Amino acid sequence: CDYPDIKHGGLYHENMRRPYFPVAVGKYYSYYCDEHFETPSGSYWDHIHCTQDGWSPAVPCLRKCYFPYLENGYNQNHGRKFVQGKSIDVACHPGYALPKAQTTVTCMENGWSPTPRC
Amino acid sequence: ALTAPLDHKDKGLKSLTLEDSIAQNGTLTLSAQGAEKTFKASLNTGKLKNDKISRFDFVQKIEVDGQTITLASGEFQIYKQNHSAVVALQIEKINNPDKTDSLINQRSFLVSGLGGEHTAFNQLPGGKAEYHGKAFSSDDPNGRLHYSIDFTKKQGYGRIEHLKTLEQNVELAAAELKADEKSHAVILGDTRYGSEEKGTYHLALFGDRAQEIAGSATVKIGEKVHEIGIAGKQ
């Protein structure tokens, strides 16, 4: 495996490790995830492994979306963390709604889609 | 270390930057003996004891939608030398995904970074040098590091002894001494149980004449990865 291109993250001790690539199958390194992202284990860091099929995890950093405060909406989901791919229905106050007749928001690689607002 | 400014009269290393120890562009708060200091993405190491681990309680935080949510918390471990330092994080708990204003127990140990005056690859002396110091892991702070560098041959090797959580001494196999992106001297090689490969170690040389070494190592026993903080001196 050559130097891992960790989209939305990176290796710890980058400077020390960079000169010694490529690495053999079975080698592994500690890595972190950037702001708005996390590892599949739900942490800010883990180890990335050089396997016969390349680097594992294949998607080392997943978007995490925090449900925002809704003015003119119900705030039962306020606080709550959602992982990339997860969706949630938006409950608005009477007389308010999500734009474009939308009913749910989804955590995409770039954040909430659409933006959760009533 | 958390409150006082930097004075020349302190036994070096005097100052340490904690960039790599701050996650998700948030803040790191270190506390000990009623004192507190927050770091946003130096620690006065000059006040700390040399050739010893200094332990501070830590809390890693991020700001989301107005609310300061705790990412993680535990014990921040720093091993101090004259021209170098090694930082490890014993994570005790992490943000509860379901109740963001609270936490859950989840233990992990990470060697997050280093600090000090790095040796330039062009500052390497001739012949050989030997280094002695500490090896520390999760609930295992009394390991020993033995390391030898042949500067002419551009090679190093060593051993980690006395790690309670390992039951075999770790061989730091013969590894090449290279220059990194900043032209600083570094080594990287295999960790072993005799001849059997278990992970990787890597060291950086510190001081104007390679007086010290500092880095980290890994041992994989089954699926469990053991991270080890390592540092030595002539």
Author numbering:
A (entry chain B): 325 to 442
B (entry chain C): 84 to 124, 127 to 210, 212 to 320
What does the paper say about this structure?
Factor H binding protein (fHbp) is a 27 kDa surface lipoprotein consisting of two β-barrels that promotes resistance against complement mediated lysis and is a key meningococcal antigen that elicits SBAs. We have shown previously that fH CCP 6 and 7 (fH67) are necessary for high affinity interactions with V1 fHbp, and that these two CCPs are sufficient to inhibit binding of full length fH to fHbp. Here we characterised members of the three variant families by identifying amino acids that are critical for fH binding and through structural analysis, to inform future vaccine design and to understand the basis of the interaction of fHbp with fH. Here we show that even though V1, 2 and V3 fHbps exhibit remarkably conserved atomic structures, differences in key amino acids necessary for interactions with fH are only revealed by functional studies.
To further understand the contribution of Pro106 to V3 fHbp:fH interactions (which markedly increases binding when changed to Ala), we also determined the structure of V3 fHbpP106A; with the exception of the change of the side chain, there was no significant alteration in the structure of V3 fHbpP106A compared with the wild-type protein, suggesting that the difference is due to a kinetic effect of the conformation in the loop containing this amino acid. For instance in V2 fHbp, mutation to Ala at position 157 increases binding by approximately five-fold, whilst mutation at position 106 increases the strength of binding by ∼100-fold in V3 fHbp. For instance, Ala substitution of Arg106 or the corresponding residue (i.e. Pro106 in V3 fHbp) reduces, does not affect, or increases interactions of fH with V1, V2 and V3 proteins respectively; our results with V2 fHbp are consistent with others showing no effect of this residue albeit by ELISA. Our findings illustrate differences in the precise mechanisms by which fH engages fHbp from different families, even though the same face of fHbp is involved. This is emphasised by the finding that Ala substitution of amino acids at the same position (i.e. V1 and V2 Arg106, and V3 Pro106) have profoundly different effects, markedly reducing, not affecting, or increasing fH affinity for V1, V2 and V3 fHbps, respectively. The dramatic increase in tightness of binding on mutating Pro to Ala at this position in V3 probably results from a kinetic effect, suggesting that in the unbound fHbp the loop containing this residue adopts a different conformation which must be refolded into the conformation seen in the complex. It may be that the Pro converts less readily to the structure required for binding than the loop bearing an Ala at this position Despite these distinctions, all amino acids from V1, V2, and V3 fHbps necessary for high affinity binding are located at the interface previously identified in the V1 fHbp:fH co-complex.
